[PDB]
Amino acid sequence: MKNPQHDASLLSNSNEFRDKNVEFFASGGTRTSKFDKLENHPFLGYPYKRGVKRVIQSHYEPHVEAGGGEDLYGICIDIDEFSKTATIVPITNNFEGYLVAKDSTVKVKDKLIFNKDGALEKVTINATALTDAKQISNEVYLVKVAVFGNK
């Protein structure tokens, strides 16, 4: 989850001001403009920090789920678990931030594509990697990219 709420017994020492932003809980983007378009959408699964596609079908309104390729619709930068909603930057809007990478092969200057699971994989092109892939936990890799659209 974006914010796994767990109670602790001791405080964690947090004084260093460097290497403190590359974390799975840091939502949004590294650089943001007031004139960026943000859309809230119902979601299924957990598409946080991933490419999202709009799935259209008691009939219900279309939702968004992790995906990419020719069906890529946007990027999920924030999520609300209580309302089960996701904040999405459409593909027509450029974005800079840390997104989920498939593995550690991605390095700087690499052109990246959103796969069927919404993860960034090396090579239409969608993003340019700005840093190396960093393992947050287990198999979760976060890479800083500058999304510009589709080729």
Added chain:
Amino acid sequence: ALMKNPQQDSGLLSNSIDFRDQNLIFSNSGGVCTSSKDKIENYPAKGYPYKRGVKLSFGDGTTELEVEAGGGDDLYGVCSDIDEFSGMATVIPITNNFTGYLTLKKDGQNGVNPGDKLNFNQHGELEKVKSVNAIALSKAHKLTEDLFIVLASVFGNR
């Protein structure tokens, strides 16, 4: 040429009596018709990408990324202004449409006419035609023997 403002000074005072054809100067930064809802970034400048297409250029890793004049399959945006003191370049992302005066390649500049499709070359200069949608809205205007500017409207990627 290599400066938005004329490097040399002047020995004359402007007349400021007419109002027609006074916007052809190279120092006319920004767009001709601009929206208040336009996303504007800034980047460190490598070279002089003023009034040219820009691409992302990286280094070894010791320093942050910068933008340099370029185009083709690496185009990132369009440079519309530069602060020389800070060496900063104002970039309009290719996802945000732009309309203004941009540098035109001095090769077939006479052939460029309103309605002609344009594209960015490897040096950030607009050339008569691929993957970017740019349309000329006027004819080439000569500022220097090698400097030509054209009013163009860029509206994304093909």
Added chain:
Amino acid sequence: YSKSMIENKVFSSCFKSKNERVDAYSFACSSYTDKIEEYLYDPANSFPYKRGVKLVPKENSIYVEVGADTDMYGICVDVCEFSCTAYVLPITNNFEGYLVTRNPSIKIGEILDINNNGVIIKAGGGPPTAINIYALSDSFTINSINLIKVAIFGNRGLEKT
């Protein structure tokens, strides 16, 4: 034709399905930071309201004329007939709203393409589509003009079939 379109002898007769009007507000979901531009349009060639338009630089001004997806500049969302001025949302911006279609039987979720008349049609016509257009609702006829709710988000990387 026109948008407003007249004295009535009597008034026209729930909240549901009251948006099916030709002169309804085009944006189903609007947003500040949406860029809207003004252009002139031909007052005798084609009425660009709720149609995909292209920029035609004429010898006196830059006009907007109904155009295909291959050379589309944006979507005409409103028209002021008094000044014959068309308001355009550039293709670089997202859109979700009602547009003019020529097929009275289009289902939800289908892939769509804009033809030479700036009209929504099924993407299976054969021309390679270059824009991401999806039908958010079934096409409905106002008695006659056919409208449909669509979502348009940018260009398509590789032209489809």
